[PDB]
Design an enzyme around this catalytic site. Sequence first.
Site, PDB file in Angstrom:
ATOM      1  CG  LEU A  13      -4.065 -26.808 -30.004  1.00  0.00           C
ATOM      2  CD1 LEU A  13      -2.916 -27.639 -29.588  1.00  0.00           C
ATOM      3  CD2 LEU A  13      -3.632 -25.779 -31.030  1.00  0.00           C
ATOM      4  N   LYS A  15     -11.234 -30.660 -31.057  1.00  0.00           N
ATOM      5  CA  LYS A  15     -12.243 -31.278 -30.200  1.00  0.00           C
ATOM      6  C   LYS A  15     -13.036 -32.329 -30.970  1.00  0.00           C
ATOM      7  CG  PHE A  18     -12.551 -40.657 -26.967  1.00  0.00           C
ATOM      8  CD1 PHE A  18     -11.214 -40.491 -26.624  1.00  0.00           C
ATOM      9  CD2 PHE A  18     -13.208 -41.806 -26.533  1.00  0.00           C
ATOM     10  CE1 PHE A  18     -10.554 -41.438 -25.833  1.00  0.00           C
ATOM     11  CE2 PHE A  18     -12.550 -42.749 -25.739  1.00  0.00           C
ATOM     12  CZ  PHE A  18     -11.235 -42.548 -25.376  1.00  0.00           C
ATOM     13  CB  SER A  20     -10.979 -31.327 -26.108  1.00  0.00           C
ATOM     14  OG  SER A  20     -10.656 -31.198 -24.735  1.00  0.00           O
ATOM     15  CB  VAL A  21      -5.767 -31.434 -28.372  1.00  0.00           C
ATOM     16  CG1 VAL A  21      -4.305 -31.016 -28.186  1.00  0.00           C
ATOM     17  CG2 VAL A  21      -5.876 -32.959 -28.395  1.00  0.00           C
ATOM     18  CE  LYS A  40      -7.005 -38.090 -26.528  1.00  0.00           C
ATOM     19  NZ  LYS A  40      -6.619 -39.222 -27.428  1.00  0.00           N
ATOM     20  CG  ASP A 134      -6.643 -45.004 -35.931  1.00  0.00           C
ATOM     21  OD1 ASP A 134      -7.539 -45.683 -36.434  1.00  0.00           O
ATOM     22  OD2 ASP A 134      -6.405 -44.987 -34.701  1.00  0.00           O
TER      23      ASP A 134
HETATM   24  C1  LIG Z   1      -1.219 -26.874 -34.016  1.00  0.00           C
HETATM   25  C2  LIG Z   1      -1.475 -28.158 -33.257  1.00  0.00           C
HETATM   26  O1  LIG Z   1      -2.589 -28.575 -33.159  1.00  0.00           O
HETATM   27  N1  LIG Z   1      -0.379 -28.720 -32.715  1.00  0.00           N
HETATM   28  C3  LIG Z   1      -0.374 -29.930 -31.959  1.00  0.00           C
HETATM   29  C4  LIG Z   1      -1.489 -30.711 -31.691  1.00  0.00           C
HETATM   30  C5  LIG Z   1      -1.241 -31.890 -30.985  1.00  0.00           C
HETATM   31  O2  LIG Z   1      -2.316 -32.669 -30.685  1.00  0.00           O
HETATM   32  C6  LIG Z   1      -2.133 -34.008 -30.390  1.00  0.00           C
HETATM   33  C7  LIG Z   1      -1.769 -34.882 -31.414  1.00  0.00           C
HETATM   34  C8  LIG Z   1      -1.580 -36.247 -31.152  1.00  0.00           C
HETATM   35  C9  LIG Z   1      -1.777 -36.665 -29.826  1.00  0.00           C
HETATM   36  C10 LIG Z   1      -2.153 -35.784 -28.825  1.00  0.00           C
HETATM   37  C11 LIG Z   1      -2.340 -34.450 -29.088  1.00  0.00           C
HETATM   38  C12 LIG Z   1      -2.305 -36.555 -27.531  1.00  0.00           C
HETATM   39  C13 LIG Z   1      -1.996 -38.019 -27.907  1.00  0.00           C
HETATM   40  N2  LIG Z   1      -1.697 -37.980 -29.340  1.00  0.00           N
HETATM   41  C14 LIG Z   1      -1.300 -39.069 -30.022  1.00  0.00           C
HETATM   42  O3  LIG Z   1      -0.733 -38.908 -31.101  1.00  0.00           O
HETATM   43  N3  LIG Z   1      -1.487 -40.273 -29.433  1.00  0.00           N
HETATM   44  C15 LIG Z   1      -1.096 -41.523 -29.987  1.00  0.00           C
HETATM   45  C16 LIG Z   1      -1.816 -42.636 -29.572  1.00  0.00           C
HETATM   46  C17 LIG Z   1      -1.460 -43.898 -30.064  1.00  0.00           C
HETATM   47  C18 LIG Z   1      -0.393 -44.061 -30.958  1.00  0.00           C
HETATM   48  C19 LIG Z   1      -0.076 -45.464 -31.517  1.00  0.00           C
HETATM   49  N4  LIG Z   1      -1.246 -46.339 -31.410  1.00  0.00           N
HETATM   50  C20 LIG Z   1      -0.850 -47.743 -31.575  1.00  0.00           C
HETATM   51  C21 LIG Z   1      -2.097 -48.646 -31.428  1.00  0.00           C
HETATM   52  N5  LIG Z   1      -3.125 -48.257 -32.403  1.00  0.00           N
HETATM   53  C22 LIG Z   1      -4.331 -49.119 -32.299  1.00  0.00           C
HETATM   54  C23 LIG Z   1      -3.528 -46.840 -32.218  1.00  0.00           C
HETATM   55  C24 LIG Z   1      -2.269 -45.978 -32.390  1.00  0.00           C
HETATM   56  C25 LIG Z   1       0.298 -42.922 -31.371  1.00  0.00           C
HETATM   57  C26 LIG Z   1       1.446 -43.023 -32.350  1.00  0.00           C
HETATM   58  F1  LIG Z   1       0.962 -43.271 -33.587  1.00  0.00           F
HETATM   59  F2  LIG Z   1       2.274 -44.043 -32.075  1.00  0.00           F
HETATM   60  F3  LIG Z   1       2.186 -41.920 -32.398  1.00  0.00           F
HETATM   61  C27 LIG Z   1      -0.019 -41.669 -30.859  1.00  0.00           C
HETATM   62  N6  LIG Z   1       0.001 -32.246 -30.659  1.00  0.00           N
HETATM   63  C28 LIG Z   1       1.053 -31.467 -30.928  1.00  0.00           C
HETATM   64  N7  LIG Z   1       0.847 -30.299 -31.570  1.00  0.00           N
END
Ligand SMILES: CC(=O)Nc1cc(Oc2ccc3c(c2)CCN3C(=O)Nc2ccc(CN3CCN(C)CC3)c(C(F)(F)F)c2)ncn1
Length: 274
Positions: A13, A15, A18, A20-21, A40, A134
């Site tokens: 999905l 990379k 830091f 990869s997904v 991830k 972000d």
């Molecule tokens: C087609 C396709 O690619 N489909 C996908 C891909 C996909 O990939 C992902 C997308 C996002 C994330 C991951 C994998 C693993 C972790 N991740 C992610 O959003 N992490 C995350 C980390 C910190 C924070 C909140 N923090 C708070 C503190 N801050 C300093 C940083 C942010 C948040 C938030 F913003 F609260 F949602 C989220 N997920 C679902 N479907």
Amino acid sequence: QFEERHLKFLQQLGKGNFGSVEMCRYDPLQDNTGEVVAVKKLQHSTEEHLRDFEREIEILKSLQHDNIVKYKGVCYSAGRRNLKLIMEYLPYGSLRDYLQKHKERIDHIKLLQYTSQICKGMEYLGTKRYIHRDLATRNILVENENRVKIGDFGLTKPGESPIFWYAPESLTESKFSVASDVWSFGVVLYELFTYIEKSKSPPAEFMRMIGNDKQGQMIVFHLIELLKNNGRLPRPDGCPDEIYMIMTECWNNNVNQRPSFRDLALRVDQIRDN
Ligand SMILES: CC(=O)Nc1cc(Oc2ccc3c(c2)CCN3C(=O)Nc2ccc(CN3CCN(C)CC3)c(C(F)(F)F)c2)ncn1
């Protein structure tokens, strides 16, 4: 909860340096069925990177909202010597990609629905006392034409620079706050109304304004000086004045004068309802 032996690869999905997904299927019943998930991985489990990944998992375990990415669990692979994070799979990927790939399905009413959902996710995040930092369409994901969820890929921890979403006090003093998330939200609202058209992106537009030929730290110097003295992204073609006014109010150098996410959600929902 997520045994590595039953986690089956489906597709790569994304990379970065830091992490990869990947898309996987979690098939414990071993019958070629089961839920599809996003996974991830950390590229390099150093003491600092692993601490950062554990902090991310802890943040995600604390968040449950319709407009925030959904945590499912963790998988301990390599005989419990590696850690992977399991999330819900969202078919349309980032909102930045979706806006470019699916213009046939998007109109201003849809843009305002996504805007409203982003504000609501940010209202929720603030109740949990987190600062996003972000916020950008590359970090918002699309479940379907009616639902977006805020995330933070965190894979890559001028066209690729995050500075073009940052508030002036974040650039000059490294001060990140709810109010700087409001400034970045104003840039997300601009991204939505430019439909990710070629050359209208915040990096391309700011580089055009400062001088396309500039490189390295000179870009930073000019961006700061531009923002401090009221230089702003232009109103996108076809963007209503009322929507550009919300962007402009988010982009206030006076931190305390920026609206709140609660103010923004109400304003956007009232415009949609009227
Ligand atoms: C087609 C396709 O690619 N489909 C996908 C891909 C996909 O990939 C992902 C997308 C996002 C994330 C991951 C994998 C693993 C972790 N991740 C992610 O959003 N992490 C995350 C980390 C910190 C924070 C909140 N923090 C708070 C503190 N801050 C300093 C940083 C942010 C948040 C938030 F913003 F609260 F949602 C989220 N997920 C679902 N479907």
